[PDB]
Design an enzyme around this catalytic site. Structure first.
Site: not given
Length: 415
Positions: A101, A141
């Site tokens: 991430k 994202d």
């Protein structure tokens, strides 16, 4: 704290399985956390420095995977928790991926296009040493789009001097540059496949049945639409943030989307009764697909859910107590990170296409996603039936078992 919640969820998952203490301690800590400064030149000529993150939770199964968030409220804890959550997401669908991430603490609404491009390029220049086609593959994202993905890929290719598959360093790219077909409808297609598998497991024929979708964004609209044609179900209720509509005879997803695009909301649709989200979640249907703000099923409305199947398209829309309440009622829940795993599966397909240099068609991408989702759902459901535990717990057990087996095979943990 997000990381504390992730660790608590991992411990609860480990409670239902046989895992060594050393493996649990290994999994409770990200294997590599990188925090870098991202300096960019503003349009006024000044230099601003931003904080960037890149957390690689685990890579026993393969290169880590995970998107990059551009949010003003980004924290290292949030990135770590989402990486920890990405690990199980790729583990449940048997992808050869780890957990990763990224994130930058920035408000992109205050940045121009040139400033956004500079931010993406500087982030790539900062995190180049920990990313790669076989090391770490970022993805789009929240507040990031394929345009930023293409900018990042171009910067990575410039730095790497074209010594390898620079297309595969990052996913979600535009179709002109290493893009993949079927990305727009990935999450909805995976949700539809999981819903079909759940109906097959429960012995329900979806042809002519009713579905209510909470949330009419990208995933929600495509889920409703997918269901309507492929599954033959009747879309009787869709909702937006402003409100929701209901129609026993059925709604046309295309017309509803067009009216929402024209008027900014789905309210006051012709022939449809305006309803609030709270009674929409309580409608008498067979499939309920919350594709909106999380935590919509709580103590107040858990007892009032009448849907036979709850497909958690959104990220954790049902609380654990509501999870137990619905399980006691005999309602089958598709876990949140299993139902919406189509996006990461299609990103994996894009990475495979980029690595191989050969690109597939819509049908192939859709035939492979079908196989992956069917196998993952059936494995999770078999764990459900064998262990007599909640589906969510079964999916967690499957993911943690796969990661633990991969860790044991590498020799990282001796027990």
């Amino acid at each position: 704290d997000p990381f504390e919640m992730a660790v608590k969820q991992l411990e609860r998952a480990a409670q239902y399985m046989d895992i060594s203490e050393e493996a649990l301690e290994w999994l409770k800590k990200p294997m590599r956390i990188v925090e870098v400064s991202v300096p960019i030149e503003m349009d006024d000529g000044s230099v601003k420095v931003f904080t960037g993150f890149r957390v690689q939770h685990n890579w026993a199964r393969g290169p880590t995977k995970g998107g990059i968030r551009w949010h003003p409220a980004e924290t290292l804890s949030t990135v770590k928790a989402l990486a920890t959550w990405m690990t199980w997401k790729v583990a449940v669908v048997d992808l050869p991926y780890g957990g990763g991430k990224g994130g930058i603490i920035v408000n992109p609404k205050e940045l121009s296009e040139r400033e956004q491009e500079r931010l993406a390029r500087a982030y790539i220049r900062a995190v180049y040493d920990v990313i790669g086609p076989w090391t770490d593959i970022p993805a789009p994202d929240v507040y990031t789009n394929p345009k930023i993905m293409g900018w990042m890929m171009d910067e990575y290719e410039t730095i790497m001097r074209r010594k390898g598959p620079a297309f595969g360093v990052i996913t979600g790219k535009p179709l002109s540059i290493g893009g993949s077909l079927g990305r727009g409808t990935a999450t909805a297609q995976g949700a539809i496949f999981t819903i079909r598998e759940a109906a097959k497991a429960l012995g329900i024929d979806l042809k002519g049945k009713k579905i209510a979708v909470q949330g009419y964004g990208n995933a929600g609209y495509y889920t409703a639409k997918l269901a309507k044609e492929q599954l033959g179900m009747t879309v009787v209720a869709v909702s937006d943030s402003r409100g929701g509509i209901y129609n026993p005879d059925g709604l046309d997803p295309d017309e509803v989307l067009k009216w929402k695009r024209e008027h900014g909301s789905v309210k006051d649709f012709p022939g449809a009764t305006n309803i609030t989200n709270e009674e929409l979640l309580e409608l008498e249907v067979d499939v309920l697909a919350p594709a909106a703000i999380e935590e919509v099923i709580t103590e107040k409305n858990a007892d009032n859910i009448k849907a036979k199947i709850v497909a958690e398209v959104a990220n954790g829309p049902v609380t654990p107590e509501a999870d137990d309440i619905l399980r006691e009622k005999g309602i089958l829940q598709i876990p949140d990170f299993l139902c919406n795993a189509g996006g990461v599966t299609v990103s994996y397909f894009e990475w495979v296409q980029n690595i191989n240099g050969y690109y597939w068609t819509e049908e192939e991408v859709r035939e492979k996603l079908d196989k992956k989702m069917t196998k993952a759902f059936w494995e999770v459901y078999n764990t459900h039936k064998d262990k007599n535990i909640h589906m969510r717990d079964a999916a967690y057990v499957v993911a943690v078992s796969r990661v633990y087996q991969a860790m044991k095979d590498r020799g990282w943990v001796k027990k």
